[PDB]
Amino acid sequence: GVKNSIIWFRKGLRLHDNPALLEACKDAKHVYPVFVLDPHFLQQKVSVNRYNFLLESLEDLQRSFQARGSRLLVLRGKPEEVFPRVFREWGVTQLCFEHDTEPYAKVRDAAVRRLAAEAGVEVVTPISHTLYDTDMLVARNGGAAPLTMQSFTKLVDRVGDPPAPAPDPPAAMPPPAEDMPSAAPAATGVPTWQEVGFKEPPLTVFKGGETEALARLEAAFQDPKWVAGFQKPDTDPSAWEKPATTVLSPYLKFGCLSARLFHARLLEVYRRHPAHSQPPVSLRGQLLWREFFYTVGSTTPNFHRMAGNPVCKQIDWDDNPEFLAAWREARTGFPWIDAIMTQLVTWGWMHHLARHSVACFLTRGDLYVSWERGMEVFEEHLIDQDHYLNAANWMWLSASAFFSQYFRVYSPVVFGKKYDPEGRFIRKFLPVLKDMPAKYIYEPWTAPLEVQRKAGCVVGRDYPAPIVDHAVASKACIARMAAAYRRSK
Ligand SMILES: Cc1cc2nc3c(=O)[nH]c(=O)nc-3n(C[C@H](O)[C@H](O)[C@H](O)COP(=O)(O)OP(=O)(O)OC[C@H]3O[C@@H](n4cnc5c(N)ncnc54)[C@H](O)[C@@H]3O)c2cc1C
Ligand SMILES: [Cl-]
Incomplete structure (x- = not known):
């Protein structure tokens, strides 16, 4: 009763x-x-x-x-x-x-x-969990999910603003009934990482919880000029003391931060800054990328694999366990790549363009290993691992879906040099190269033997040699991708 x-x-x-x-x-x-x-x-x-x-x-x-x-x-x-x-x-x-x-x-x-x-x-x-009813966006678009971001932005603009965030719960809530056996505090408490079976302590610097999510939200909105003029492709991937983006992805994954509350705070700033950035590069556009991949993935069968995926390309990726282990263990010989992979296993979070480098290097850029194998590595260590987002972006970087410009290959030697010429990001996560001069910090094998010994890092003894020559490997990967794009018909 x-x-x-x-x-x-x-x-x-x-x-x-x-x-x-x-x-x-x-x-x-x-x-x-x-x-x-x-x-x-x-x-x-x-x-x-x-x-x-x-x-x-x-x-x-x-x-x-x-x-x-x-x-x-x-x-x-x-x-x-x-x-x-x-x-x-x-x-x-x-x-x-x-x-x-x-x-x-x-x-x-x-x-x-x-x-x-x-x-x-x-x-x-x-x-x-998402901004809109993703099944409603499919019905409003004639019964199919949009496949391009440009068409998805035109759709959400016809639908209108997302629903407003719900009000906060009351100050007092109905407590659970007392003396219930299955509600005993001894068997219903929050466990620690030692009790669940882990033997190694966590090394990340990002703490979970709704309170930490709301604290990171306000810290980003303390400068309304930075939020309005936010352009994603112009952010710094080598920034680690203060990351160039919001780093709200682990809180949006577990739901510690409402996406509708994020969107509600963005519109308040946009109505006071008329020159604010527009999608897909705006901060609001980043939430739409999350909403766009959720809309396609939830309506695409086998969205997280290659075979059976109607939107993924059937590329003849290589089955090379040696290139996978070197890329997974961060011993590829390229400090820019090995530093990002060290940040993966240490922090569990990397910048978007930093994840671009390692994903392009493993797949269509150098090693030609399937994006499924690297996706298994990211899903293990990423604290913001999202099923639909980790897949669509691995297919983006592997030129299997959405993205198709395989002639654009990031260089593991020059890409990071444009942001951090002194290699401050490398010396942090790869302290073996902390005494290496900036002239050879991205290519330590090019340094003379006298400099390698003077810095305490001899290539081949303290830091591994590059597993591949980028010029030979990239030109081989591009040509094979062209043959893959010619058999699609
Ligand atoms: C190889 C690869 C793997 C990735 N896997 C994941 C994943 O598992 N989980 C994940 O959250 N993101 C993933 N991304 C997207 C992107 O790397 C991160 O969302 C972003 O780097 C997180 O930093 P941020 O929260 O500061 O981003 P911001 O710039 O602050 O973006 C704000 C929010 O928008 C969303 N967002 C931003 N960029 C993207 C994007 N490209 N696609 C979808 N949503 C986006 C996220 O929820 C993010 O918190 C992947 C991208 C690549 C290239
Ligand atoms: Cl480049």
Whole structure:
């Protein structure tokens, strides 16, 4: 005779702009904030940087629910086995969670709705992870998703502004009922990275949580001139003391920051700065790139692979395990490439143009290894790893989809020199080259043997030689891509 609701967290790890949380609290007697954790996830993939980022995001929710008289419940096990138990135990009448469009999510969410229907539980799945209803944009475009960014911008302009961010939850929330067995604090607490099974500590400098996301949002909007005149291709990839972009991707991935709140703050600045940048280079355009890849990926089968993907090109990539290990272990011999790969495993985040260099080097630029193999490396270490975004950009850099200018090959020796001629980005993440003069910091093998010894870095003993000559490798990759683009017909 009362409303007992469950707000199930998967993504959307936040309290602001959470329509699923608001519906769960309205006229609610008891609310159960639940996150389902599988304690056998490492026993099957995931770096300690991203998994601890998720754990720090749950601790942020825990302090937020406790300040409002509630408590976050971290249930162990699988959703299909735990929810039918807590439905009858807690007397649940309504289940609410943010809508997700990932392939594993749809199969998972379909089974839970079945279990909730057999238990008489109402299911409310509002859309708040993306800007718009991605299925509505497909219907408004005649039934198919746009394939070009120019056509996608014309579509979202006809639809209009995204929905406004939902209001904040009340200051006090209905707490979970007391003395419930499955709600015992000893078995529902937030674990640490040592308990889950990781043996190495995290090395990233980015802390998870809604509070840190909101702090990074305000820090970016403290200069409205910088937000308005933001142009993505003009940012600095070598900037590490202060990254050239917002670095809000790990918070938008886990849902620690609402994309609609991000978009709402952008329009406030744009209406006071009439000369603000326009898509696709604007800051608003970057959210559209996220929205554009989500719209195509959710409606494209096998979007994360090559075979069976209707939008990906069937290129005869090489199966070279030696080039993959050198690229994965950051021992390619090119300091600009090895520094970005060291930043991948240390911070779990790199600048967009920095990810352009290593993705072009592995695929259509030098090694000609499949973008699927490098995507497996990024998904392991990137703390902002997004299923649809990591794929469409790996297909962009490999010239398999969306992008088609394979004659444009980044140079692993000159690309980084234009931003950082002294190699400050290289000496930080590759301290073995910290005494190397700037004349040979990007090409250490060209330095004389007297200079290599005087800097404590002899090429071939302390730092590896380049695995390939870029001129020989790039000209070979470009010609093979041309033959690939001629067999497409
Ligand atoms: C090889 C490769 C792999 C990548 N994989 C991912 C991934 O798994 N997850 C991810 O979030 N981004 C990915 N990107 C896109 C891009 O690298 C990052 O979004 C960006 O570098 C993050 O920095 P930022 O948050 O400061 O970006 P900003 O310039 O601040 O952009 C703001 C937001 O817009 C979105 N965005 C920006 N650029 C892109 C883009 N090119 N495509 C889609 N959305 C974008 C992100 O949500 C980002 O937080 C990939 C790109 C490449 C080339
Ligand atoms: Cl270049």
